[PDB]
Design a protein around this ligand. Structure first.
Ligand code: A1I0N
Ligand code: A1I0N
Ligand code: A1I0M
Ligand code: A1I0M
Lengths: 493, 493
């Protein structure tokens, strides 16, 4: 083919259209309460009736679900109670609830394409990364239900894109665009941490990327001039204000909204001290008013303590070492009359290729450093910097979203690897531009064939496991056997 | 005072004498089976009657206990069964069993002094490190029982000393002394890993110290000449042979001894496949012979699998974050008639000072690097290199023996921090030579007063908690209250 801005735009539009198609196709088929739709639907409904409740997660995801429900006009009283009850016979708009994660997943694919486009890679690399995210069964299966992991993944991708936009403005510090993208990176990180607490890992990524930059900004002998200590102080203050203080303010604002919406007694009042019982205006009596900081501190301590002790066992808990190569998958919902399972797992071909390319990138960096120690360059200036500045950045994200799961010893599931795997899909694309590289990009035919073959193979693998992702077509017993690759408990054999 | 080789020798002799005094004083007082003397005494006895058994730990520690028992001549049939039965009314030499860990603890204090002496520090620094190890209640309490953690700590200290000896010979590579100390470092690491599997962490330390060295040996532009690739290949081959292959050979040799000693049926035969039942010569019948590698592989796989699933709950399991500052301690043995407890905990003053000095060293390194980035040296060549080569090495050991406990999520106890705390006692001494430094060592009076004050305070703290370490003097209820500093469950209040 060829390469031009028009081709970039055409590819981006097609990728976004196919993302919206795949995430929304058959979104209402399970039409029943599924693996963890129970809790989050309960909390979204409690938001709608303004009755107070208690949860261990930060509120923003359930606020988004409640906003989607409120937009339709549903208030109702169908607070979910058990896995396996029909939504349609209860006059509840579950499709409206499920449309938000689908929109966020489609926007996640678009943001992946935007990250690869903004970093400066060629069209085949952006297409490959966006297609690996597009044709992934785990991302599709997570953006299908009432689950707040899609919001987490979208916020992490948005933070990566915002920081890439901001870093390219390093030549015009303290300008309007500079401050705008700094604040936007902070806001994306704030949303990421206000969805789930594991979003803190994104703060590590953008943290590390900042620190290195600050180190580069602290060198007294650097090619781009030198900064006096007050100027570096201004830079550090700007980073701290835009990346630490604004995220905390947005987090606090989301709890302020949570407290303002909930002004009625409900299930979860007893977790608070009697003054908080007094301030809920127990209805369906006198009510007091407390300062916001006191209520926030009490709720935060209680939430941390309950997350420290209130753990419910699940048979499909996984360990971090099983994630990058898909050694085991989780099952969400199944009924025996139609022989339909919704067993949640990634795309085995895509995940294996992405992890293998992670290993190849590690080996390439090691070989380049070893050759440099001998005094051999072997890399152009442009191809070195990118491989350490852009691709390395992506490899940073993966690491910062994968390794911290070994330190945590509570229950973890495969979907916890969805953010990190996202970054894995980026380096892959970069490494296809790298090894098959002859603005110099004449005869991208090599990378074009590489990405075409890899994406066709991943597409075949996604087509193979598509029923298990959707659960619409009832599959025969021998067809269930064909999906038993690495010991997947499909329980229909 | 003054400084000279005679003063070094006098201090070393006094430190060793006091170590042997403190570790052996009242060694037979508990005169009863205690917290984990059960299992290890059982296995040492089974070694003595040559009856086969199964354990999850590598055999070397129980081989040492069985050798100590065999030296006296005891064979008997007193395989331990429950916590809290009298040794003396059963004609068993428990004092002989307990003398080995006491000897190893005294030698550990001596080896700490030797490490500080060989590295080049002044007398007050060596005295401070050796005294912090000497006046530590946790090290004393671990080298008191039939427990194989003292062997682990002694082997780690010996590996550190052996590698310091070897590295000083870097100017005469491939000589007899060079190879001798390389093999000795490998053998010390082999003993460390053949006692308990956590000894692998020492392989990290000496691993890292080697890697940096190899990096320095790989630089094509380095002050001390340049090595062609074959010469660096010879260096890497020597490191791999002395640090990887010899340790594995010694580990295999210890299993060979274990298999040769055990040629009778016993408790633990059923964990093996029927061929291994056939090779045990079931007595108290035909017996076959298997190749050693097959038996070793079967036993190793079974041991790993049982350690992966066979966990027994304990009420005093701790987490790594509680260790450096002694937030909680474990109780081993107690009887209510004499009001005697043997609650195991470190020396709070010594541990707090050691951890605080770890933090101070981190801050000092950070400040030095930050000042260097501005282009300010602020450190002499001699004082820089030491702080990064010797003291840093010690800080490496601590890290490599502490952080890997967060990755592991099984049950961990406070004694697991005994190796790492050892390295913490080294940096402390170094930092007392560092900050109070005016061969230039005129007027060490500052460091002399510093170490005198710190060691007097630690000695008072050790005297305060000495009954809880020994359990000989029955303490009153109000005296139990005085030891309730950071919430220690003494259960005699
Ligand atoms: C086990 C260890 C292993 C295997 C791997 C370790 C991980 C590794 C390798 C690295 C860790 C991560 C690293 C190093 C950095 C992450 C954070 C950083 C530094 C940045 C954040 C990412 C981020 C937005 C990077 C921005 C990159 C954008 C696309 C650059 C825009 O083009 P741009 O003009 O600057 O290119 C060049 O600009 C030069 C100007 O000077 C010029 O000279 C050249 O001609 C050329 O124009
Ligand atoms: C969060 C991060 C923080 C806070 C800390 C990070 C950890 C840090 C700071 C460091 C990590 C560990 C490091 C850097 C190294 C560990 C392993 C290494 C390199 C060695 C193993 C330890 C080890 C046996 C070191 C041996 C040191 C012996 C005592 C040196 C003997 O005296 P010697 O003549 O060589 O001194 C000088 O020899 C020069 C010759 O050139 C000469 O010029 C000088 O005049 C002067 O005679
Ligand atoms: C001086 C700075 C330097 C050197 C350089 C500049 C660095 C820079 C400019 C930016 C990044 C700075 C860095 C490295 C960190 C900053 C983030 C931080 C510590 C705070 C800011 C984040 C916030 C706005 C709110 C944090 C919420 C609070 C209050 C607590 C959370 C507790 C968490 C998150 C517990 C994680 C486990 C979780 C329980 C598992 C369950 O999991 P789940 O809920 O999913 O089931
Ligand atoms: C190429 C090399 C480079 C780059 C540079 C040169 C590096 C160099 C020269 C030296 C060091 C090399 C390094 C970094 C590692 C080498 C060690 C290694 C992996 C093997 C050698 C060690 C052996 C002789 C035997 C190992 C026993 C075996 C077979 C398995 C054990 C399993 C372990 C240990 C499981 C740890 C958890 C434990 C279960 C907790 C329970 O705990 P507990 O039992 O206490 O209750």
């Amino acid at each position: 083919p060829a390469g031009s801005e028009r081709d970039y735009k055409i590819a981006f539009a097609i990728i976004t259209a196919l993302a919206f198609l795949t995430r929304f196709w058959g979104i209402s088929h399970p039409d029943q309460v599924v693996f963890d739709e129970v809790h989050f639907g309960k909390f979204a409904s409690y938001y709608l009736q303004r009755t107070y409740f208690f949860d261990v997660h930060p509120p923003l995801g359930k606020l988004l679900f409640a906003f989607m429900g409120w937009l339709v006009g549903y208030d109702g009283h169908f607070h979910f109670d058990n896995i396996g009850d029909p939504y349609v016979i209860n006059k509840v708009p579950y499709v409206a609830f499920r449309a938000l994660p689908a929109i966020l997943g489609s926007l996640t694919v678009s943001v992946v394409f935007l990250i690869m486009w903004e970093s400066g890679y060629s069209l085949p690399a952006c297409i490959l990364a966006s297609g690996l995210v597009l044709l992934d069964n785990a991302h599709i299966g997570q953006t299908r239900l009432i689950l707040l992991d899609a919001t987490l993944v979208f916020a992490m991708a948005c933070s990566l894109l915002c920081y890439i936009k901001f870093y390219k403005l390093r030549h015009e510090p303290f300008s309007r665009k500079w401050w705008k993208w700094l604040i936007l990176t902070g806001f994306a990180l704030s949303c990421d941490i206000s969805t789930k607490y594991v979003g803190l890992f994104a703060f590590i990524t953008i943290g590390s990327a900042v620190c290195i930059d600050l180190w580069d900004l602290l060198n007294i002998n650097r090619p781009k001039g030198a900064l006096t200590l007050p100027q570096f102080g201004k830079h550090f203050a700007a980073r701290a204000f835009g990346l630490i203080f604004m995220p905390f303010m947005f987090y606090l604002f989301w709890f302020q909204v949570h407290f303002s919406i909930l002004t009625r007694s409900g299930p979860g009042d007893d977790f608070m001290t009697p003054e908080f019982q007094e301030t809920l205006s127990d209805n369906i009596r006198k009510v007091k008013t407390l300062p916001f900081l006191r209520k926030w501190f009490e709720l935060q301590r209680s939430m941390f303590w309950h997350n420290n002790q209130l753990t419910a066992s699940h048979p499909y808990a996984s360990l971090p070492y099983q994630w990058p190569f898909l050694l085991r998958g989780v099952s969400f919902w199944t009924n025996s009359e139609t022989r339909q399972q919704i067993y949640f797992l990634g795309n085995p071909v895509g995940w294996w290729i992405a992890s293998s390319v992670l290993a190849i990138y590690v080996g390439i960096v090691l070989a380049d450093q070893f050759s440099l120690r001998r005094g051999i360059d072997a890399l152009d200036h442009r191809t070195r910097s990118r491989l350490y500045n852009s691709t390395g950045f992506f490899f940073l994200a993966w690491a910062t979203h994968y390794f911290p799961f070994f330190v945590m010893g509570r229950q973890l599931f495969l979907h916890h690897y969805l953010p990190a795997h996202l970054a894995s899909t980026l380096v892959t694309g970069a490494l296809v531009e790298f090894i098959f590289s002859p603005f110099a990009g004449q005869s991208l035919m090599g990378s074009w064939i590489a990405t075409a073959v890899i994406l066709a193979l991943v597409a075949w693998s996604w087509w193979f496991f598509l029923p298990l992702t959707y659960g619409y077509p009832g599959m025969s017993v021998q067809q269930v056997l064909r999906r038993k690759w690495l010991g997947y408990d499909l329980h229909f054999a």
